Curated annotation (Swiss-Prot), chain A:
Disorder named in the UniProt entry: Acetyl-CoA carboxylase-alpha deficiency: An autosomal recessive inborn error of de novo fatty acid synthesis associated with severe brain damage, persistent myopathy and poor growth.
Post-translation changes: The biotin cofactor is covalently attached to the central biotinyl-binding domain and is required for the catalytic activity.
Free-text tissue specificity from the UniProt record: Expressed in brain, placenta, skeletal muscle, renal, pancreatic and adipose tissues; expressed at low level in pulmonary tissue; not detected in the liver.
Source organism, top-level taxon: Eukaryota
Encoding gene (name): ACACA
UniProt remark on domains: Consists of an N-terminal biotin carboxylation/carboxylase (BC) domain that catalyzes the ATP-dependent transient carboxylation of the biotin covalently attached to the central biotinyl-binding/biotin carboxyl carrier (BCC) domain. The C-terminal carboxyl transferase (CT) domain catalyzes the transfer of the carboxyl group from carboxylated biotin to acetyl-CoA to produce malonyl-CoA.
Name of protein: Acetyl-CoA carboxylase 1
Covered range of the whole protein: 1101 to 1393 of 2346
Described purpose of this protein according to its UniProt entry: Cytosolic enzyme that catalyzes the carboxylation of acetyl-CoA to malonyl-CoA, the first and rate-limiting step of de novo fatty acid biosynthesis. This is a 2 steps reaction starting with the ATP-dependent carboxylation of the biotin carried by the biotin carboxyl carrier (BCC) domain followed by the transfer of the carboxyl group from carboxylated biotin to acetyl-CoA.
Subcellular location as annotated: Cytoplasm, Cytosol
Subunit details: Monomer, homodimer, and homotetramer. Can form filamentous polymers. Interacts in its inactive phosphorylated form with the BRCT domains of BRCA1 which prevents ACACA dephosphorylation and inhibits lipid synthesis. Interacts with MID1IP1; interaction with MID1IP1 promotes oligomerization and increases its activity.
Amino acid sequence: ESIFLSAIDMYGHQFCIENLQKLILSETSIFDVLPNFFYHSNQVVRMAALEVYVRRAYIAYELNSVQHRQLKDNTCVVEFQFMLPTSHPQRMGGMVSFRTFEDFVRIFDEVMGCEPIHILNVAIKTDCDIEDDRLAAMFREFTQQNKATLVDHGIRRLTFLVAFPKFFTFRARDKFEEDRIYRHLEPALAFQLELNRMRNFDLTA
Amino acid sequence: WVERLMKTLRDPSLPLLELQDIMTSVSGRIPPNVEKSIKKEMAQYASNITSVLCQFPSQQIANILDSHAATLNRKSEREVFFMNTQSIVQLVQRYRSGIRGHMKAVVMDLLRQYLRVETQFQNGHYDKCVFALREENKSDMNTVLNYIFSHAQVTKKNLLVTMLIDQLCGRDPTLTDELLNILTELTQLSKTTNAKVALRARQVLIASHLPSYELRHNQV
């Protein structure tokens, strides 16, 4: 929290940069803390979060371009362009944060404006009562109606990050919007589980 | 003019446009290897405009150019390469320290232009300075006239210098070993007409040694 909030007064002092580099390049988990940086007072740390978390998560991916965009709101988005060197032979993605439910559904088609290579992630401030069913139904109610993830350009998966962090990954393209297998997993760190090895099995989480 | 210079120098897309202008005017006589490397680096920097963990890749362009130089291909690969890349070398040299370092260095150059004039009107009366300049510049009296002409409008120069110092060492409590030398020389302008530019300079020399309220707030 100190590293994240201290770089926001003025960035480019050549010590906050290395601190963010340490946070991205460290082995210790910091995902129990990152989702809580919605603003906390500042409204710029959003970008500072959105660029670190992804960087922290997408370790097996060759990330070549990060960009910070903002809508004419208090909605900052970060877009990413990356690729796999020697796996499934260019991907893109983006991440945005919202407040408690509604800014997500309100400007969903706008924040989307970053083969279905696009990967869209979203974080929402619901810091209460770890309850998979309620949050899952809340997000699924919107994904079951809004199919922009298929008809806009094609988005492989939509990740719902509840702020310790609870991850609900959905695919509103062909299948029912639910995933009991990759729940609570970061979709970029889903490879670091050796769970795809269970090829000959129908799994039940 | 000062505010627009400040905002322009802080806009990350400026050296991108300088790169585009020097490279578009030179489409040939450059090896395709260094050209493609520069293209990829500037495309990355363009895709990462106005985002954290982003700086102009001057060092990477310098690296690929100096690598092709280290290979040192002979017989019209040496001379053509070393000549038709000097613009990009100058571009990375200007932005060797990033957009912020270039921003500070430009104002430093303006302040050095100020000192270039005013350091000749200290250490003596007016007539002593004029005589010394005539003795130093025997082969041309235009130089002495330029000196006197510049010194005539020293009050307007002082106003612009105050506006420059306001944006060079303001909300950034830190000073390098180059700004400090300019400020030291600028504070030694004992002549009262330049007191305005000395006094403010001393403020900087004492202002950039204070806490930013972030250390105390975070720790407490």
